[PDB]
Amino acid sequence: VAFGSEDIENTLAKMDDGQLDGLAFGAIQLDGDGNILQYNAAESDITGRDPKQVIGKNFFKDVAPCTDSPEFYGKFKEGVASGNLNTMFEYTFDYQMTPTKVKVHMKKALSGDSYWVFVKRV
Numbered sequence: 001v002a003f004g005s006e007d008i009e010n011t012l013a014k015m016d017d018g019q020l021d022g023l024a025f026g027a028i029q030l031d032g033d034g035n036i037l038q039y040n041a042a043e044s045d046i047t048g049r050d051p052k053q054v055i056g057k058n059f060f061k062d063v064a065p066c067t068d069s070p071e072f073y074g075k076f077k078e079g080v081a082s083g084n085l086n087t088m089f090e091y092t093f094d095y096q097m098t099p100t101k102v103k104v105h106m107k108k109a110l111s112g113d114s115y116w117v118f119v120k121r122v
């Protein structure tokens with residue numbers, strides 16, 4: 001399945017973490033407060049993060065401080081609150097990694113209590 005698909009959450013809902021590693025784009029699943037539930041192979045190839053070492057940590061506080069801003073983290077909380085997280089925008093990842101421009105797609109998961117952050121290079 002492709003990045004930005006209109007029903008991407010349906011497709012990923014039925015995938016085990018083994019299949020998540022096969023996606024063409026980065027995929028991070030977070031709970032309502034931003035804690036990392038899943039972190040696929042594609043994302044680690046972009047950021048250099050070891051899934052083993054980031055799963056369980058908080059994305060906005062510990063792992064990705066540059067995303068702790070109104071336009072990323074702020075948008076995330078608004079979507080968690082409204083129950084309708086679904087937005088795509090461009091961003092630059094630069095903490096402990098070479099500055100990398102990406103396109104981000106945040107979307108609520110089907111469980112309704114977990115959320116997706118999808119990433120691809122631009």
Ligand SMILES: *C(=O)/C=C/c1ccc(O)cc1
Binds near residue numbers: 028
């Ligand atoms: C900005 O500091 C972003 C850091 C970051 C983004 C996404 C990741 O998967 C890991 C680190």
